[PDB]
Amino acid sequence: MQLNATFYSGTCPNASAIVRSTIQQALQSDTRIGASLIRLHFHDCFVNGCDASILLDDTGSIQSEKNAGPNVNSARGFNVVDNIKTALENACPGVVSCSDVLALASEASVSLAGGPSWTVLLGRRDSLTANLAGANSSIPSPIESLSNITFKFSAVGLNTNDLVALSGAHTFGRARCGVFNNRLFNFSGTGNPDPTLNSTLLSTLQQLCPQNGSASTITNLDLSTPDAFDNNYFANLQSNDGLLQSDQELFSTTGSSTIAIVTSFASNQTLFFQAFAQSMINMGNISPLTGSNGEIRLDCKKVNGS
Ligand code: HEM
Ligand SMILES: [Ca+2]
Numbered sequence: 099m100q101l102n103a104t105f106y107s108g109t110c111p112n113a114s115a116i117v118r119s120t121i122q123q124a125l126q127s128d129t130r131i132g133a134s135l136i137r138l139h140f141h142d143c144f145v146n147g148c149d150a151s152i153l154l155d156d157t158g159s160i161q162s163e164k165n166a167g168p169n170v171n172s173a174r175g176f177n178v179v180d181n182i183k184t185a186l187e188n189a190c191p192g193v194v195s196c197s198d199v200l201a202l203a204s205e206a207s208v209s210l211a212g213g214p215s216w217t218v219l220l221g222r223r224d225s226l227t228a229n230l231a232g233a234n235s236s237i238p239s240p241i242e243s244l245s246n247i248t249f250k251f252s253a254v255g256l257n258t259n260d261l262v263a264l265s266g267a268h269t270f271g272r273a274r275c276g277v278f279n280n281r282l283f284n285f286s287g288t289g290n291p292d293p294t295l296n297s298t299l300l301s302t303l304q305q306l307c308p309q310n311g312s313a314s315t316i317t318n319l320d321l322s323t324p325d326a327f328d329n330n331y332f333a334n335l336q337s338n339d340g341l342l343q344s345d346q347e348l349f350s351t352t353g354s355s356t357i358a359i360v361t362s363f364a365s366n367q368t369l370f371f372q373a374f375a376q377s378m379i380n381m382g383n384i385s386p387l388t389g390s391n392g393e394i395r396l397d398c399k400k401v402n403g404s
């Protein structure tokens with residue numbers, strides 16, 4: 099079956115408002131939570147489709163994706179997903195899937211932060227299983243080459259236009275020293291820092307992230323506007339201020355089609371927002387469970403009846 103915008107119209111007509119209100123409240127005590135929630139939809143959709151597989155906790159039969167590399171000591175906001183789900187169950191018992199919660203939460207989080215709105219497609223059902231191993235092989239790493247990140251997007255059905263647009267989600271949220279410290283001292287065995295990192299930002303990060311220091315310390319992905327959803331992410335790349343290798347590679351890779359897409363988005367926020375919305379719908383359409391497949395989870399952490 100197809101996902102559609104009006105799936106909950108007759109059963110939980112206020113779902114969008116409930117999700118948005120809940121995240122607005124969460125934002126008052128955690129300005130990062132919107133960023134964290136949209137990343138959960140990304141890590142969901144990239145493994146066994148947008149099926150809420152990532153939300154399942156370990157059991158005797160389930161090996162949770164929360165311990166997959168990209169998620170461990172990194173993914174967050176699971177409690178807030180639970181609170182969104184509780185609010186929906188209070189209003190609309192048994193109706194909204196956890197998979198749809200993550201799609202709805204992504205749009206709310208982006209719009210609340212000053213980003214675009216878009217028409218969320220709905221009707222996804224929740225998996226009965228998790229895929230930790232697939233998370234380890236399917237989700238791109240910040241130190242991968244542009245060609246290998248591109249390959250991982252293509253394997254789930256997103257193209258280069260989608261990659262550059264969706265990378266703009268790094269306009270908000272945080273990253274730890276450990277996922278960019280290879281840039282700072284001895285980049286790829288060369289004995290020198292990554293030359294595509296601005297020397298000013300370099301010295302700031304060397305002090306934040308000393309060689310013998312903690313890899314868990316965080317900074318902002320977007321030093322311009324850390325919590326605001328805007329095109330500043332792309333402007334940063336133009337001044338060698340992207341934080342991850344995978345960020346800066348979009349602009350600094352010689353002869354890459356991605357350079358012009360970066361400059362389009364830096365030059366025109368409307369074009370960025372239009373592309374971002376379309377690419378989020380594209381990502382949200384990856385391998386949904388529909389009809390009899392999957393279930394509607396009561397509690398996003400566990401399968402029904404368990
Ligand atoms: C293009 C390939 C991508 C790579 C290599 C990548 C990598 C990462 C890494 C390494 C972090 C830092 C994790 C931390 O240290 O705890 C991060 C954070 C984040 N990513 Fe990405 N990412 C990618 C694409 C995306 C996409 C497609 C989205 C959503 C549309 C997304 C949304 C975010 C957000 C919002 C955060 C901040 C999360 C938070 O503060 O809790 N990323 N990403
Ligand atoms: Ca999934």
Ligand SMILES: [Ca+2]
Pocket residue numbers: 269270320322323324325326327328330331
């Ligand atoms: Ca920003």
Ligand SMILES: [Mg+2]
Pocket residue numbers: 333334337
């Ligand atoms: Mg600038």
